[PDB]
Write a protein that binds this ligand. Structure first.
Ligand SMILES: Cc1cc2nc3c(=O)[nH]c(=O)nc-3n(C[C@H](O)[C@H](O)[C@H](O)COP(=O)(O)OP(=O)(O)OC[C@H]3O[C@@H](n4cnc5c(N)ncnc54)[C@H](O)[C@@H]3O)c2cc1C
Ligand SMILES: NC(=O)c1ccc[n+]([C@@H]2O[C@H](COP(=O)([O-])OP(=O)(O)OC[C@H]3O[C@@H](n4cnc5c(N)ncnc54)[C@H](OP(=O)(O)O)[C@@H]3O)[C@@H](O)[C@H]2O)c1
Ligand code: NA
Length: 537
């Protein structure tokens, strides 16, 4: 029995559509599957107020850099979601990729057929399709879901979850005019920090329910002149080589100096300058030991805390906005447009729900351990937590992917898992999404997988699976790299420690943090050497 398809690609975000385009371009038969109506992923689903890139538009736009849509015109230095969706749509047109997709269709199960070396993919628990290779591009973040909070359904006002915002016939978000309404926003991640300032413009009152403050820095967004855009486009071959060489694929690289190689005076001027410069420079152009050394991190953390105390008038509000929890840059840093100055407004209140946890949502609003809040609107900006978990993925011996990774993700090259032959996992925390410019990182990863699939076709191979030794070595290296950073202690739950019944200890990280260029170099050493570490047949 032979499969109907060379490959199934799950997902129509920037990663999946590019992967599908590439497979078809190589003269293979691909079917893409997408839950939503159309292309975009992130940029299709997230329509909340203030949704905007943290990556410079020209650097995220890999499809423009690569010469798929080089004529593309960015209107701002950090594109908003509507422009992002137009971008993805234009790319999809040029790739002529929509014809290879089933939209409005959810993959419910994927089961590997050992005797046939193929994947049975189940669509909406009904139709089954067969493919040689299954490729997930289901997103590094999973699921809009109501958060773990009692009484959400009881609220009589307007509810919004940030990743499911209601829209009008044009696709533009609706119910965004908060004139005369008392608003609650739960969560202060990158999503909340984008919503809060804009909600404040129209809301009668705004309560921010903050469980943990993040380190946020100014975005410094501005419009993009035609002159600048043309100048950038002309420089695209240089820009593409540059972003292909930095550790994150953002257009920034670490200063070669340690924090202690300069005086306190010099560090101060250095930070002051970066802080005022648009984009991630203050994080990604920092001293080389910023994420390796406690003292170095403290220099910058102390500086950013100084800035928060500058921008927020009330000294009490300010200290509750400054993290003590974690080092600077240990989470992907939220960038902001006048975030801190929002709290200076009369109609804006910070509610500390660490000290006073939410007990439940109510017909009238929200109830904390020591107060009740009457509200007309609640916005859940409460995040995402994996996209693969929602699919019943079964490998050899009917083993669940969920179980195989229960002790932490285990892969070779971040791309295949032993037990799951012919299955590629694109763009997730386990292969570097967390801190990447995903437009570039994801695109490069899809090209590598294409090259592997093409090699197998050329050689008549129909089976690929990592050896246990290659997978173990790779996964142990990924942990070792991670453990040398400050992230190890900062996010404890990012490490899975298993002490087996026999007494041995296994440590895995949920988050791969190695430099992109180094990671790709390793992938090419493997590929060139006839995919050493993969069993192929
Ligand atoms: C608000 C927001 C802002 C961001 N900004 C940046 C940024 O500035 N820079 C950056 O590098 N990264 C950013 N990211 C991270 C972002 O995930 C990537 O930039 C990128 O969009 C990921 O693309 P993707 O194709 O891999 O996944 P997605 O864009 O998430 O697409 C995955 C698709 O798969 C579909 N899918 C999932 N499961 C199934 C299934 N079972 N069956 C059928 N379809 C399924 C989903 O519907 C979705 O459309 C941001 C993320 C968010 C949420
Ligand atoms: N380009 C951009 O500027 C942009 C915009 C949005 C998102 N993103 C990316 O997408 C990722 C997700 O960001 P996000 O802001 O949507 O989510 P997030 O980072 O996970 O933050 C969710 C927020 O909600 C809180 N929270 C979660 N569950 C809660 C509950 N049950 N009750 C009360 N509070 C709760 C969290 O607090 P705790 O910390 O205590 O859990 C946190 O403050 C980010 O890592 C970011 O990189 C990027
Ligand atoms: Na105030």
């Amino acid at each position: 029995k032979s499969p109907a398809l060379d490959a199934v690609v799950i997902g129509a975000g920037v990663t999946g559509i590019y992967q599908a385009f590439l497979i078809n371009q190589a003269g293979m038969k691909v079917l893409g599957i997408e839950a939503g109506e159309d292309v975009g992923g992130t940029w299709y689903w997230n329509r909340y107020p203030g949704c905007r890139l943290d990556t410079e538009s020209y650097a995220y736009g890999y499809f423009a850099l690569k010469g798929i849509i080089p004529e593309w015109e960015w209107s701002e230095n950090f594109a908003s979601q509507p422009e992002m969706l137009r971008y993805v749509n234009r790319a999809a047109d040029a790739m002529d990729v929509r014809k290879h997709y089933r939209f409005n269709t959810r993959v419910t199960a994927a089961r590997y057929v050992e005797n046939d070396r193929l994947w049975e993919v189940t669509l909406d628990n009904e139709e089954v399709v067969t493919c040689r290779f299954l490729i997930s591009a289901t997103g590094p973040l999973s699921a809009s879901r109501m958060p773990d909070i009692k009484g959400i359904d009881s609220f009589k006002g307007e509810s919004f979850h940030s990743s499911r915002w209601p829209t009008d016939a044009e696709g533009a978000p609706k119910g965004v005019d908060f004139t005369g309404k008392r608003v609650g926003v739960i969560g202060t991640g990158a999503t909340g920090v984008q919503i809060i300032p804009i909600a404040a413009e129209t809301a009668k009152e705004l309560y921010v329910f903050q469980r943990t403050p993040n380190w946020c820095t100014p975005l410094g967004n501005s419009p993009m002149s035609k002159e600048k855009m043309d100048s950038l486009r002309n420089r695209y071959p240089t820009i593409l080589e540059y972003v292909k060489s930095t550790d994150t694929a953002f257009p920034y690289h670490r200063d070669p100096r340690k924090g202690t190689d300069v005086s306190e005076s010099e560090r101060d001027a250095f930070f002051e300058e970066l802080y005022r410069q648009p984009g991630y420079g203050i994080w990604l152009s920092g001293f080389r030991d910023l994420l390796l050394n406690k003292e170095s991190n403290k220099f910058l953390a102390d500086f950013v805390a100084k800035k928060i105390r500058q921008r927020v008038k009330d000294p009490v509000v300010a200290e509750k906005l400054i993290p003590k929890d974690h080092p600077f840059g240990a989470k992907r840093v939220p960038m902001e447009t006048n975030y801190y100055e929002t709290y200076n407004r009369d109609n804006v209140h910070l509610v500390d729900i660490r000290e006073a946890p939410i007990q439940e949502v109510t017909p009238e609003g929200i109830k904390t351990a020591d107060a009740a809040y009457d509200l007309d609107v609640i916005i859940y900006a409460t995040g995402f937590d994996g996209s693969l978990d929602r699919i019943d993925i079964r490998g050899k011996d009917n083993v669940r992917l969920i179980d195989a990774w229960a002790e932490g993700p285990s892969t070779y090259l971040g791309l295949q898992a032993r037990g799951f032959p012919n299955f590629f996992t694109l763009v997730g925390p386990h292969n570097g999404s967390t801190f990447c410019n995903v437009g570039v990182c994801g695109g490069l990863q899809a090209e590598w997988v294409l090259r592997m699939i093409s090699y197998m076709k050329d050689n008549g191979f129909t089976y690929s699976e990592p050896t246990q030794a290659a997978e173990n070595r790779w996964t142990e290296e990924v942990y070792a790299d991670f453990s040398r950073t400050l992230l190890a202690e900062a996010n404890a739950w990012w490490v899975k420690t298993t002490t087996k019944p026999d007494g041995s200890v296994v440590r895995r990280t949920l988050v791969h943090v190695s430099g992109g260029p180094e990671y790709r170099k390793r992938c090419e050493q493997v590929a060139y050497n006839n995919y050493n570490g993969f069993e192929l047949a």
